[PDB]
Structure 1
Amino acid sequence: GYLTRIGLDGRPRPDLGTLHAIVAAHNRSIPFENLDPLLGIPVADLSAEALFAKLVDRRRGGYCYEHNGLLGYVLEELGFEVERLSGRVVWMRADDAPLPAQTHNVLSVAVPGADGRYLVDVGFGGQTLTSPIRLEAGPVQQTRHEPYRLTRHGDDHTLAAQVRGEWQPLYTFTTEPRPRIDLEVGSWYVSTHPGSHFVTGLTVAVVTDDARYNLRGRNLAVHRSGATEHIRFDSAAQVLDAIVNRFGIDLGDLAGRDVQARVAEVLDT
């Protein structure tokens, strides 16, 4: 189901090329969305059963713990070695802003035939990595889209991307592997705390070969070369239509919740 979900064909071999191919296909096939937290449905269970059920069988997307959770289990089953890492999102944050919570989950992946480790992150939303990169401080690393770079200060790593010119820090992380329960505590926080960006509004995102799409409330942003594109939807009806048809999210397991009404309340949050 997963391979089909992402449009790949059989069982691929556990090597570096496969990692590049699964990331690409994951990127364009499973959207980032927070419809469950938006509707008061916690993301509490990060088991394989729960994640496969939601992101594969029911054709929903999810946020970082759901995406990277799922990819983690997929890659393990193919024969990669996978450690789950946690980090703090520093994107666009004022210098001297307080230390952010650990709200992001990424993968450190070891690949038979390769020597070190790879940062894999398909769950960061509209600016997520679209290639695995080497878990190596220093070099500017090319991806399918913009250049990225890791730096290191002690045991803290920062991922930065060169976005429309500028070098922007995205998040910091340590390479300490996390047990699933510690990820579940963080996911409980991100999906239920009243000040979470994922509780107060709607975020949907996906990445094709040519563009990064990012929807917040009524505002769809599209980033491609030479141009930034901003679509403002008139009402919740158009936003749902974009959720279902543009972003490919199946709303069937949410039957009996007033999705449109909730979306209407968060068009401008």
Structure 2
Amino acid sequence: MDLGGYLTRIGLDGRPRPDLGTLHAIVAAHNRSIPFENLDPLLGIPVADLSAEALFAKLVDRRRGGYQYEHNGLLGYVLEELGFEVERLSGRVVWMRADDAPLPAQTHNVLSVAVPGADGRYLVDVGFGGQTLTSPIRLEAGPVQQTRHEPYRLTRHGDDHTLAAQVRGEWQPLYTFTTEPRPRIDLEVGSWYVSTHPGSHFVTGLTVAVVTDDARYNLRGRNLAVHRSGATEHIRFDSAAQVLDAIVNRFGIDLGDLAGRDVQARVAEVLDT
């Protein structure tokens, strides 16, 4: 594949080896280089094709970001090519959901990754957005595990795992998942739903995110949240133009890709959704 293109995109060079050190370095570089964004579903463009060709073309060659299926799909292919053993998993997002809420749809995709020298498996997820994992963690229920940012924890009931993050001193469940490997088509059916259902969070508004060594950035509509050590920031943009400026210059997304779609007018509709 075009790993050279991917490695350049994320600010690495040369062929890295399939070891744990490389896994950490790639996750960190991906985190800071390729943003989470849902401009395609926002603009009525489905995310239907999760092939390597499609994902490299968009997230690497066209300097766009993507959402969960695009991020982890891409990284899945990259890690495989490099020599890691990769299974694609699906999950249900429970973030900020009430204790008694209906069961969510399977709308997430994460990776279970092994190094050739079988020291168990690692959860890898660079596609959850602003609160995405910034390190690989051991796919092992029980222990609190440190990362490049906040502590995270896996717990399980049978094969139903829950990933939680310690967000500003408070533990928050993010999503649940099983370890049953999923074929690409089942991920594509999920992605069709998330990118086209008129009630989908990723159809009804705009989410853009990126994570640097120092901070998590998460834009929803006009509202940019920043979580840094010791402080939160909330930046409220006045209008769609400022949002578009942030998209291009803060988040590094080329909107030339979306010529003739009236991005600015659609962003205006979702400032507060």
TM-score range, shorter chain: over 0.9
Post-superposition offset of 1:114:
4.3
Post-superposition offset of 1:86:
0.1
Give TM-score, length-normalised by structure 1. 0.99
What secondary structure sits across from 2:111 in the alignment?
Answer: strand
Give TM-score, length-normalised by structure 2. 0.98
RMSD across aligned positions (CA): 0.6
Distance 1:135 1:265 in 2: 40
1:133 aligns with 2:133: no
Distance 1:33 1:20 in 2: 23
Is contact 1:43-1:188 (8 Å) kept? yes
Distance 1:183 1:92 in 2: 24
Show CA shifts across 1:134-157 (max 9, x none). Answer: 001111111000001100101100
Show CA shifts across 1:22-54 (max 9, x none). Answer: 000000000000000000000000000000000
Post-superposition offset of 1:256:
1.2
Select 1:77's aligned residue among 76, 81, 84. 81
Post-superposition offset of 1:223:
0.6
Distance 1:146 1:99 in 2: 27
Post-superposition offset of 1:225:
1.6
Post-superposition offset of 1:226:
1.7
Structure 1: segments with no counterpart, 5+ residues: none
Distance 2:104 2:179 in 1: 17
Show CA shifts across 1:149-190 (max 9, x none). Answer: 100101100001111001111110000000000000000000
Distance 2:234 2:140 in 1: 35
Post-superposition offset of 1:80:
0.4
What secondary structure sits across from 1:49 in the alignment?
Answer: helix
Select 1:54's aligned residue among 35, 53, 58. 58
Distance 2:172 2:257 in 1: 37
Is contact 1:58-1:253 (8 Å) kept? yes
Is contact 1:157-1:172 (8 Å) kept? yes
Distance 2:26 2:33 in 1: 10
Is contact 1:218-1:235 (8 Å) kept? yes
Distance 1:184 1:9 in 2: 31
Distance 1:257 1:90 in 2: 33
Question: Percent of aligned positions with the same letter in both sequences?
Answer: 100
Name 2:178's counterpart in structure 1: 174
Q: List 4+ stretches of structure 1 deviating above 2 A.
A: none
Distance 2:213 2:10 in 1: 14
Post-superposition offset of 1:130:
0.1
Distance 2:109 2:247 in 1: 24
Post-superposition offset of 1:129:
0.2
Post-superposition offset of 1:113:
2.9
What secondary structure sits across from 2:17 in the alignment?
Answer: coil
